[PDB]
Design an enzyme around this catalytic site. Sequence first.
Site, short mmCIF file in Angstrom:
data_model
loop_
_atom_site.label_atom_id
_atom_site.label_comp_id
_atom_site.label_asym_id
_atom_site.label_seq_id
_atom_site.Cartn_x
_atom_site.Cartn_y
_atom_site.Cartn_z
N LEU A 110 -3.35 10.84 13.53
CA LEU A 110 -3.09 9.44 13.87
C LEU A 110 -2.54 9.32 15.28
O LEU A 110 -2.39 8.22 15.81
CB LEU A 110 -2.12 8.82 12.85
CG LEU A 110 -2.62 8.80 11.40
CD1 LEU A 110 -1.59 8.11 10.52
CD2 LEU A 110 -3.95 8.05 11.32
N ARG A 121 0.84 -1.18 0.00
CA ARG A 121 0.00 0.00 0.00
C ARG A 121 0.88 1.24 0.00
O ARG A 121 1.47 1.58 1.02
CB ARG A 121 -0.88 -0.04 1.25
CG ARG A 121 -2.00 0.96 1.28
CD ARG A 121 -2.74 0.82 2.59
NE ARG A 121 -3.77 1.84 2.73
CZ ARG A 121 -4.05 2.47 3.87
NH1 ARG A 121 -3.37 2.17 4.97
NH2 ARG A 121 -4.99 3.40 3.90
N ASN A 123 -2.40 -0.91 11.90
CA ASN A 123 -3.17 -1.82 12.74
C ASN A 123 -4.61 -1.97 12.29
O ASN A 123 -5.02 -1.41 11.27
CB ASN A 123 -3.13 -1.37 14.21
CG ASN A 123 -3.74 0.00 14.43
OD1 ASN A 123 -4.82 0.30 13.92
ND2 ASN A 123 -3.05 0.85 15.19
N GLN A 160 3.07 1.66 3.22
CA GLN A 160 2.75 0.62 4.19
C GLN A 160 3.23 -0.74 3.72
O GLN A 160 3.10 -1.09 2.54
CB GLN A 160 1.24 0.55 4.45
CG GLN A 160 0.88 -0.42 5.57
CD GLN A 160 -0.59 -0.39 5.93
OE1 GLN A 160 -1.23 0.66 5.88
NE2 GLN A 160 -1.13 -1.54 6.31
N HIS A 184 -1.98 5.18 16.43
CA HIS A 184 -0.90 4.35 15.91
C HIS A 184 0.36 4.64 16.71
O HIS A 184 0.66 5.79 17.02
CB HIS A 184 -0.67 4.66 14.43
CG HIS A 184 -1.82 4.29 13.56
ND1 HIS A 184 -1.97 3.03 13.03
CD2 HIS A 184 -2.92 4.99 13.19
CE1 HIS A 184 -3.12 2.97 12.36
NE2 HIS A 184 -3.71 4.15 12.45
N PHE A 195 0.91 10.72 1.53
CA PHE A 195 0.42 10.10 2.75
C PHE A 195 1.47 9.19 3.41
O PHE A 195 2.13 9.59 4.36
CB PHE A 195 -0.86 9.30 2.47
CG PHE A 195 -1.48 8.69 3.70
CD1 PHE A 195 -2.23 7.53 3.60
CD2 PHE A 195 -1.33 9.28 4.96
CE1 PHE A 195 -2.82 6.95 4.73
CE2 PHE A 195 -1.91 8.72 6.09
CZ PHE A 195 -2.66 7.55 5.97
N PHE A 232 4.09 1.56 8.70
CA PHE A 232 3.99 2.53 7.63
C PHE A 232 5.02 3.63 7.88
O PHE A 232 5.44 3.85 9.02
CB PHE A 232 2.56 3.08 7.48
CG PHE A 232 2.05 3.88 8.65
CD1 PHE A 232 2.13 5.27 8.64
CD2 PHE A 232 1.43 3.25 9.72
CE1 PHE A 232 1.58 6.02 9.68
CE2 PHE A 232 0.89 4.00 10.77
CZ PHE A 232 0.96 5.39 10.74
#
Lengths: 161, 5
Positions: free
Chosen positions: A119, A52, A99, A60, A123, A57, A110
């Site tokens: 976040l 990903r 997660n 991942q 995270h 952004f 990530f």
Amino acid sequence: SQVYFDVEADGQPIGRVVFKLYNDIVPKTAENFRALCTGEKGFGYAGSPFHRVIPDFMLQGGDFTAGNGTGGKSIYGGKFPDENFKKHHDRPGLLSMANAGPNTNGSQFFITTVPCPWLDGKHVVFGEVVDGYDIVKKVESLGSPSGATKARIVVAKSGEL
Amino acid sequence: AAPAX
């Protein structure tokens, strides 16, 4: 405590990324990532993909069992609780645990390419990029909004320094 | 699947 990833895109070496882990703040989370990098437990990141990659952004990866976000596991057995949220996602180049909700840390992680303060508390941040950020950028440039990549990007080799 | 995106 530094660990690294040798990244490849379609079998082509793109470069080595080095991370500094925050062992003093999140020792349990850092140890999990370190061990997965060396593969000393019999399983780890070598050969796992960045399934990903989303421009503007983050990147991942870490799913070494299914390579699609549905797999991966920690060195503690299954998934482990969120250690703490002391470190914040204030800038790009940070290593954080991906997660499936509260206390579901496994092996997926990530790398931020932009500040992600929303976040914080969700995270666990446990490291930062100290060498090869340009490689993180090259990987990001190969991603898309959906996270899909045209090239097969993987952590070809990993270990500790 | 988190972080969302």
